[PDB]
């Protein structure tokens, strides 16, 4: 059997500074408010935001972050989602600064239903540079997949409405996690994206505080004081060119709510990775991460690899996490049989079974990024926007086996709400 799902996502983007929590949440109650007075509004059954909303990111030490940590059932990120769900009837997706009882600290995102009840607390796997500062820790329990009960959203293929209740098996990545394992790991591998594949993820939750590439990165320019200021003044020039402030855009919102406006396929270049055009998205970025769920997108390879039978010695190979994460704290020569599992797995897109495993299939990725600057090096891109693999037979923007449903700005605060409509199998 085959279920018709029309789902209804909203999409927050903030710019959260360190120190400003309450300023944050007066905002976005401001937004919110917006929203609902929109002329093309519809009650969303989900609501996204960023990673580390309310709080900010750019954390350099333990002691600073700890003002702001909260337990997954308790603080301000809680209270708001909460509200929230309760205030429009939907699950409410946040990043927050967590900690346990064991005074262990995370970078998590916390999942409330539309009664008012945290049904899931995910942690982020793969940590960036800057979770390193504060003592973050990986996710012990790696990537997970997680159901989603939606009341009245699914319908039969000749139905005239969506009557039907439909538990989706959604899934929760943070910025890092669409990344290779440390910046160091092959590109080939896409943990992130191979994993959703694999457990047959059809809807994908992704919280972001991505950089955007005009941002100062390189290790000897933030060690060398002479090389850090003048790196820091190009940074001050781009944004007041801009006029704008240092910290980025505040107050102005952008809101998509109703519209179908789809984003234009762009090729990555010169240019579109310049921090200009605040209204428009980074496409850099967007190229990037469409990239980074390879194992969705068509590839017209994927019939040499599985006819030559190539990656089937990859697949098997292949392990749930990296053998030194946090998640641990041959089947050709044994006599073992093969299970399912193994025949779920797959690499580049390819299983043991079959060259595109998600051919056919549909799924819908939803990315909230956050805007702004801090610390006058670290620039946001943004970009926050809804995307659909038809999973219909180009390694970026210009495949047509990805849907941009719509994006956001790179550097204005606002929301943007889509209605999206796949299929699903039961």
Known sequence: ??????????????????????????????????????????????????????????????????????????????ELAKSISEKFQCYTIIGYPEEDDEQKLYNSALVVNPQGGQIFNYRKTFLYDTEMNWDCEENPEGFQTFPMDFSKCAKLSNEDSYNRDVTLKASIGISMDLS????????????????????NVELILCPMAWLNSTSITD???????????????????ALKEQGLPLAGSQGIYQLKIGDSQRTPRVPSDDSTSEYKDMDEPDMSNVNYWILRFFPFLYFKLRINWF??????????????????????????????????????????????????????????????????????????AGSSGIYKFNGKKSLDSLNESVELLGNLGKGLEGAILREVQFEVFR
Request: proline share 5%; aromatic share 10%.
């Open 180 to 199: 290779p394992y440390k910046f160091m790991a092959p590109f080939n591998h896409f943990e992130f994206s191979s994993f959703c594949v694999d457990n």
């Open 307 to 380: 006819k030559n039978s190539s990656l089937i010695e990859s697949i098997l190979g292949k392990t749930r996490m990296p053998l030194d994460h946090e998640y641990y704290k041959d089947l050709l020569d044994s006599e073992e049989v093969i299970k399912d599992t193994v025949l779920e797995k797959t690499f580049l897109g390819t299983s043991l079974g079959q060259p595109w495993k998600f051919q056919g299939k549909n799924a819908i990725l939803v990315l909230a990024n956050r805007c702004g600057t801090e610390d006058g090096t670290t620039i946001f």
């Open 1 to 78: 059997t085959k279920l018709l799902v029309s789902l209804k996502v909203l999409v927050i983007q903030l710019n959260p500074q360190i120190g400003q929590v309450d300023q944050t949440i007066k905002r976005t109650w401001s937004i919110l408010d917006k929203v609902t007075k929109s002329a093309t509004y519809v009650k969303p059954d989900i609501i996204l935001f960023p990673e580390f909303a309310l709080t900010g990111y750019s954390f350099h030490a333990r002691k600073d972050i700890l003002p702001y940590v909260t337990k997954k059932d308790e603080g301000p990120s809680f």
């Open 219 to 237: 290790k000897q320019t933030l060690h060398n004081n002479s090389l850090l200021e003048a790196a820091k003044n190009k940074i001050a020039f």
